[PDB]
Amino acid sequence: GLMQFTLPVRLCKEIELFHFDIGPFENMWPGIFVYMVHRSCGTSCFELEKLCRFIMSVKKNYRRVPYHNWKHAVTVAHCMYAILQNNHTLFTDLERKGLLIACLCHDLDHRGFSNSYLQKFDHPLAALYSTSTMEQHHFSQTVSILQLEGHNIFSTLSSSEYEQVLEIIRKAIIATDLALYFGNRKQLEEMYQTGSLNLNNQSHRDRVIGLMMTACDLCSVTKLWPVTKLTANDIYAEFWAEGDEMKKLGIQPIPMMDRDKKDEVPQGQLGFYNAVAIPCYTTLTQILPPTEPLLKACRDNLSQWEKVIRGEE
Numbered sequence: 001g002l003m004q005f006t007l008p009v010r011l012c013k014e015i016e017l018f019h020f021d022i023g024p025f026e027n028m029w030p031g032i033f034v035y036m037v038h039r040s041c042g043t044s045c046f047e048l049e050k051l052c053r054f055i056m057s058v059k060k061n062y063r064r065v066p067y068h069n070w071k072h073a074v075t076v077a078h079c080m081y082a083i084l085q086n087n088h089t090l091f092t093d094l095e096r097k098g099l100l101i102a103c104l105c106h107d108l109d110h111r112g113f114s115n116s117y118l119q120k121f122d123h124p125l126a127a128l129y130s131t132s133t134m135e136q137h138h139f140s141q142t143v144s145i146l147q148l149e150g151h152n153i154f155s156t157l158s159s160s161e162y163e164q165v166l167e168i169i170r171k172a173i174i175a176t177d178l179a180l181y182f183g184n185r186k187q188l189e190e191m192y193q194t195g196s197l198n199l200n201n202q203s204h205r206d207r208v209i210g211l212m213m214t215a216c217d218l219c220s221v222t223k224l225w226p227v228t229k230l231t232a233n234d235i236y237a238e239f240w241a242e243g244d245e246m247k248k249l250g251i252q253p254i255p256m257m258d259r260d261k262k263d264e265v266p267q268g269q270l271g272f273y274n275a276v277a278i279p280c281y282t283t284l285t286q287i288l289p290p291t292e293p294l295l296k297a298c299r300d301n302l303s304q305w306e307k308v309i310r311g312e313e
């Protein structure tokens, strides 16, 4: 109860910045995450005996994939933590509790394949969920772990606070289905231009949290160039594996995934930052001004990829 976590000075300072890397030491990530809950939400809002067990069950149910892994979970939670702490008043005590849990669980039991690959493979999970396949799987795994004994971190909420918090987490996890991002950004844009946006409209908050979630989920692109560059490798390791699996199914895959089209990557990154990342953070900064560091860091990296093409690295 009087048992706050501390961190090495460098981590204590660097953790409050959007562009924080959580480092190569697996065994501190749980301490980092707990620390984020305790500053973001209070020393009280989760019983330590129960949080720590939830964290360790969630670690266990991520897999050893190059990108969609436990380290990705915690990066995404960190980024959400930075947004909450720079947007201190805008969000309820419940939103704070649910969104960090949402982020930690957002990719539970991911195998490193797209919704598309399950559909073309005819994987059972595509039968049981037609759209946002992995995302309904991830929310489903999250509820399963919450029902293990000594794992209900929410035990002390009222029935209705409980239903609110699980409903936050579910929409939050679903929003990480980038297929849904595009229209969710379009609608939020139109509501901020035409000034109709209202953060007491619960359908409006929903969209906003949805964008926050896209932003956190993509936040490897808002890191210092050396981190972005090296995470790009991890994401492509998965893509090229999927491309290989597409070919096995006798389907020439999209070039993003053809490991014989490695040359076309830097142009592909350009396309992506232009089509997706820049738009995401632009609209996010438009809505939540204190998140600009994300847009600035995104732009730097876009520029770093322009320099790649021009032969300058």
Ligand SMILES: CNC(=O)c1ccncc1NC(=O)c1nc(C2CC2)ccc1Nc1cncnc1
Pocket: 178, 218, 220, 221, 228, 229, 231, 232, 233, 235, 256, 268, 269, 271, 272, 276
């Ligand atoms: C939707 N279009 C495309 O996904 C795209 C197209 C052409 N090339 C690349 C593309 N996607 C990505 O690069 C990418 N995608 C994603 C999710 C799967 C969708 C997440 C992070 C990414 N980048 C990244 C991350 N961390 C460090 N460096 C880079």
Ligand SMILES: [Mg+2]
Pocket: 106, 107, 134, 176
């Ligand atoms: Mg995902």
Ligand SMILES: [Zn+2]
Pocket: 072, 076, 106, 107, 176, 217
């Ligand atoms: Zn993710």
